[PDB]
Amino acid sequence: SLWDVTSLEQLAQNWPQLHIPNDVDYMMKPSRDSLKHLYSSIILIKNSRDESSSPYEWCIWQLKRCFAHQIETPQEVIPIIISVSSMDNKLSSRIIQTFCNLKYLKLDELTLKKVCGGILPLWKPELISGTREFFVKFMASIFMWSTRDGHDNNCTFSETCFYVLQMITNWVLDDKLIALGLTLLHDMQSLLTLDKIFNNATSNRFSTMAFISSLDILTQLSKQTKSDYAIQYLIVGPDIMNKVFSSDDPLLLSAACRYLVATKNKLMQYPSTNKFVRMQNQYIMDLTNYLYRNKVLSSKSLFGVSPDFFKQILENLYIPTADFKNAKFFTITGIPALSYICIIILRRLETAENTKIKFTSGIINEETFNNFFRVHHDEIGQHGWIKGVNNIHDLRVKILMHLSNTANPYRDIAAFLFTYLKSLSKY
């Protein structure tokens, strides 16, 4: 009897004479019990792993009676259920089809979340074909249910999305289902980049936050070499790219430009006049001057949006000064995301060399810099402030070089700038 088994040597010796009992509820739920950890696993071994296997039906029925909220403590069983299932391909897919529809969502969007985080990242679909449609439908359903009326957001779609992204890592790491990864991938992205959840007014970073991980996944894949998958399944596309480069989390733009630089080594091989390079160097040709040498009025189509839109909106945009407005706020020193971070950079930097001038405001800006550069002219002219500085561009290269020493999550931005600017290429 399995209960009679006490040591690993007991199971080794009495193996064939062993009797499989039917006390599944005691064997799965948490001396003579030393091997209880192995108890479940070994039963899938005495008999082959059939669908009717006692722990399979036990755990799926447990998951049922958990979704429907009859269980005294739903939380306590989930880790158990995940454990046997997280590392069982067979049992997983059954639970997937049984619990990964909109049908099994309105009962509890919270427990489906957790079991997803458990099972989803660890899975290889048995049949490749009838899953993409399935997951696309499933996630579109979760989106429709999450961004509905009377309930703004509780990160139910974003984090489930992130778990699906995890699973796509497990997939793309293996072969022959990478195409299922990098095709569900952009389909999930285009669902993440919807205005009602991917916002610039009420963002609810969860999407944006889950989004960088998503972009990081193929960034990771972008860095790793020796793999055959069409880059067509790699370039995130301008439909959802421009909505990110126009966002306001700084680290969103950071991971973005990370993915950007971490494609250059894996894109320059393709021809210049290339269907997908054409939009990549597009992100390059412009974002290089959405944080830097802002010539947006001289150029055209900042993010695909025509420039003179900015001509219009800049008028009727009241500014106390009129000295420099056209270029007043379009860089590090003037983007709404990483401008306030930049004056923290400047302050913490001045705090180091023990300056005695103490920049008496915060915004770095071509006009407010000239003030503090002229009304404190001579004393700084001797010393007491950042050494190299002679012109605003010098402040920019300095805040970059400091931003490129890894303690700051935004570090990738400076890497992008150095890699793609070629003017400050000398760092």
Binding site: I45, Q166, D239, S246, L251, L317, F329, S361, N371
Partner: protein
């Protein structure tokens, strides 16, 4: 809690405000082609997204303008400008953890998948052997 309730009512009002502004931009840029065309309202998904980024990017430039009229001369008495800094340094404090805690998952998961893969290569052999019985 006078000032705190004032700030919370500020939050409510401004939320309603930005929502109405957003849809107003939407509704106007709808109405425009409503009138220029006669019935053409079949703006496609690609067409719908360009409008989206245009509106967000105007929302962008309007929100950087404030960052020009509230900072160069820090009043430090403005009940609203004091709200800026403490609601501006607060934004980027948590920026380190997300970057770190996303790396603290993209590796942990590599251990999970590896241990599961060894469990797979193990279970299969074990069933093969129990069948060699």
């Amino acid at each position: 809690n006078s000032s705190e309730k004032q700030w919370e009512r500020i939050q409510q009002l401004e939320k309603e405000h930005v929502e109405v502004y957003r849809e107003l931009l939407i509704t106007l840029d709808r109405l425009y082609l409503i009138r220029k065309h006669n019935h053409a309202v079949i703006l496609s998904h690609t067409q719908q997204r360009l409008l989206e980024i245009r509106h967000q990017l105007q929302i962008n430039l309007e929100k950087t303008a404030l960052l020009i009229r509230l900072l160069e001369k820090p009043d430090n008495t403005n009940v609203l400008f004091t709200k800026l800094q403490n609601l501006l340094e607060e934004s980027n404090s948590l920026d380190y953890e997300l970057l770190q805690s996303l790396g603290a998952q993209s590796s942990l998961h590599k251990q999970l998948i590896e241990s599961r893969a060894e469990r797979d290569e193990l279970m299969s052999k074990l069933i093969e052997l129990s069948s060699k019985f």
